[PDB]
Amino acid sequence: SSQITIQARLISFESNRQQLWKLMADLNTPLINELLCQLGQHPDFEKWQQKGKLPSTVVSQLCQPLKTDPRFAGQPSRLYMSAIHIVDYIYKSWLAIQKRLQQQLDGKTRWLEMLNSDAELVELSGDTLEAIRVKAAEILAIAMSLSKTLFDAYQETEDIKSRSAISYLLKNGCKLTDKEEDSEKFAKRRRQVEIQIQRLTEKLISRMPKGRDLTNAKWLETLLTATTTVAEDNAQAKRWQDILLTRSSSLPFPLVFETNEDMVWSKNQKGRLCVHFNGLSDLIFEVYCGNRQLHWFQRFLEDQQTKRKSKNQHSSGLFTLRNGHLVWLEGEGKGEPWNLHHLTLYCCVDNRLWTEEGTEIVRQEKADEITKFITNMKSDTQQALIQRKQSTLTRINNSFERPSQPLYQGQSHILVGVSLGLEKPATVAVVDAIANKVLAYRSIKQLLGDNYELLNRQRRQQQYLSHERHKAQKNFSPNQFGASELGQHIDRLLAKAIVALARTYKAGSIVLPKLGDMREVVQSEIQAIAEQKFPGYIEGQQKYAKQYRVNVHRWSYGRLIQSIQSKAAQTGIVIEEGKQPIRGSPHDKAKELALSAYNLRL
DNA sequence: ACGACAGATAATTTGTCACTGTACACTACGCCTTTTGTGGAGATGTCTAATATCTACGTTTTAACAGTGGCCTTATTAAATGACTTCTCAACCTTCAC
């Protein structure tokens, strides 16, 4: 996770900002909207959902006739390209989501079929429980990936004895068990799977990507319709209401510049770094950044100047800058939108390209990938692709003469396990795995140190700000706020503390748990309990454990994992994934998480 | 011869009267002992109703709270917020413009 974003304000005189706003809002965003509409109507759309993959070129092909439609014709080539990238990534995202959800629904539907109680397994096997227990002992002795191997063994073995023995073996977590099945805990575990299947089935009714209408013409024409026309029935009037409540999108889609050299850097005579974008060189924007990021923007000019001095004998494949996003940030107050909103550039950089040693890491990664490509790839334009790839492979050998910082060296036998929990967001154990000894624990309080008071602040603000929103909603007041930025701050403080401890003990890796989807587990567990406690009373079921379900939906385990992954990559510490045990305290969970990831190395 | 007539005669008792021996001399029912049935205290032994004491019999009363039972409507779409997921993160070459 070595890619990170740095940002700066872009400043320019009003006519440059107005011209860019009108390009984005009047042409580029309407084009994106049109591409999303046409792409969702394509005759292959239903087979793209089955593959879960979009064709590499279909957005580019749809955009070609639109580039000369009077609605969209006025744009530079890179703005059409940006619109293509926006639309292509949206569907690459959405088709990947739907594909995995469909696989989850199919997987659990098979499990629901093969989850049979011992009373059902007796009939469906025709064998006594001891007989299927012995047959499961044989099938386990052959399947010795074990879970998948049993799922593979189940499907084509139509022999109901072995098929039931696999069912019995899978019910217990791929192992034998002597103890009797508690019939109500089984019936609950069956009911959980039905709820999960239903909730997956409902999630697969997701909407197609909606776009951003900045005119909101549909709202005003619906208002005129609903006020002067009789609704033909309740369903038309409901559709009218649903439109009238829909909020207006203020801001256009950002521009995306996937060619780092489509940002051209310079220093003006007042000494400020400046940038202009390919196709819009007349609009000079001035960089206004914090000094904590200035060294990156200075590097972008130095990388640009280095390759010009070498007459392009360097490769921009090793430019520290990777891509840019050009974004309008919503301004407070009033004005024309190019005056109200603040133009902001977000630059992706790869942190390894800062140093010379890290650049050598990237160079070999580039060289191996391109040598693979050239070997596997072998038309005129496809031969031109090979020649560009071969030019890259030649030019990445030329050095940028970057700062030298020796790479981190961590001991392979020292690991940090990080236990994640709802009550204690992180707990760490430094384990010496060949010694099987814990070198150090730290609690959440020791990780946060002097910041530990922020953790009670978060809980207190989450309560307070929720209640103030609840009160504000009843007044239709816009003053609705929350603690997300404090929560993000805490997760970043924890990430830095964990990695600093890992560096201090020379740990080779940080071990993080494969939590899965905690929210759908908790939500289906609690619903199965509540349906027994409040039969036929839906509101009673939804009130049951409401605050626990809320707490689990706020638990930011993904954001914390992501923050740890970024900080570890910036110091070259390996991340490993392990299985967090359910037994024990957060300290013991962290220790056994660490040691299991060591033993799982094969 | 004996004894047998009437009457003598030696007893026998009746009655006188001088003499003398004696008590009157105040001087026993009184002193003393033992038994003994009746009687007067006065230490001591006899043995109860009863007015408690002295706990328990257990029996009510409380409140605490535990368990049963009724009710609670459910859907769509938009918005805000908090999150999750996915995708992306070229580069050399050509052409026309001073």
In order, the DSSP letters of A339-350 are HHSEEEEEEEEE
**DSSP 8-state assignment for residue A23:** I
| Total number of residues shown for chain A | 602
Give this entry's resolution in angstroms.
2.3
Helices (H) and strands (E) counted in chain A, each on its own, are 24, 12
Length A21 CA → B74 C1' (Å)? 47
Could you give the CA distance from residue A419 to residue A581 in angstroms, rounded to a whole number?
9
Residue A2 tokens, joined: 């070595």
Q: A259 beta carbon < 7 A from strand B? A: yes
Length A62 CA → B54 C1' (Å)? 112
Handedness of CA A81, A87, A93, A96 (dihedral sign): negative
Q: A96 beta carbon < 7 A from strand B? A: yes
**DSSP 8-state assignment for residue A511:** E
Length A349 CA → B32 C1' (Å)? 173
Cβ-contact A273, A298 below 8 angstroms = yes
Could you tell me the CA-to-CA distances from A106 to A22, A163, A516 in Å, in that order?
47, 19, 18
Looking at this protein, which amino acid is placed at residue A306? T
Cα–Cα nearest to A496, from A565, A441, A413: A565
Alpha helix (H) residue ranges in A423-556: 444-448, 453-474, 484-504, 518-533, 538-543, 546-554
Q: Strand B: which of residues 464-523 in chain A lie with Cβ below 7 A?
A: 469, 473, 480-485, 487-488, 517, 519
Handedness of CA A110, A113, A118, A124 (dihedral sign): negative
- The residues near A355 (Cβ < 8 Å, ≥ 6 apart) are A402, A403, A404, A405
Alpha helix (H) residue ranges in A40-76: 45-51, 58-66
A42 three-state secondary structure: coil
Q: Position of tokens 């007041």?
A: A477
Looking at this protein, which amino acid is placed at residue A598? Y
Could you give the CA distance from residue A46 to residue A42 in angstroms, rounded to a whole number?
8
Length A560 CA → B75 C1' (Å)? 37
Q: In chain A, which residues are followed by a C-to-N distance beyond 2.5 Å, i.e. a gap?
A: 144, 378
Complete edge-to-edge strand list for the sheet that includes strand A342-350: A255-257, A321-329, A342-350, A3-11, A285-288, A273-277, A263-267
Residue A558 tokens, joined: 């993904």
Q: A245 beta carbon < 7 A from strand B? A: yes
Could you give the CA distance from residue A35 to residue A509 in angstroms, rounded to a whole number?
44
Nucleotides of B under 7 A from a protein CB: 72-93
Q: A344 beta carbon < 7 A from strand B? A: no
Q: Strand B: which of residues 14-73 in chain A lie with Cβ below 7 A?
A: none
Residue nearest to nucleotide B80 (CA to C1'): A480
Host H or E run for residue A323? strand A321-329
Q: A246 beta carbon < 7 A from strand B? A: yes
Length A281 CA → B93 C1' (Å)? 20
Q: Strand B: which of residues 291-320 in chain A lie with Cβ below 7 A?
A: 312, 315-317, 319
A505 three-state secondary structure: coil
Residue A5 tokens, joined: 């974003």
Query: Can you give A300-312 as a three-state secondary structure string?
Result: HHHHHHHHHHCCC
**DSSP 8-state assignment for residue A128:** -
Cβ-contact A425, A490 below 8 angstroms = yes
Q: A99 beta carbon < 7 A from strand B? A: no
Q: A382 beta carbon < 7 A from strand B? A: no
Work out whether strand A437-442 and strand A321-329 pair parallel, antiparallel, or are unpaired: unpaired
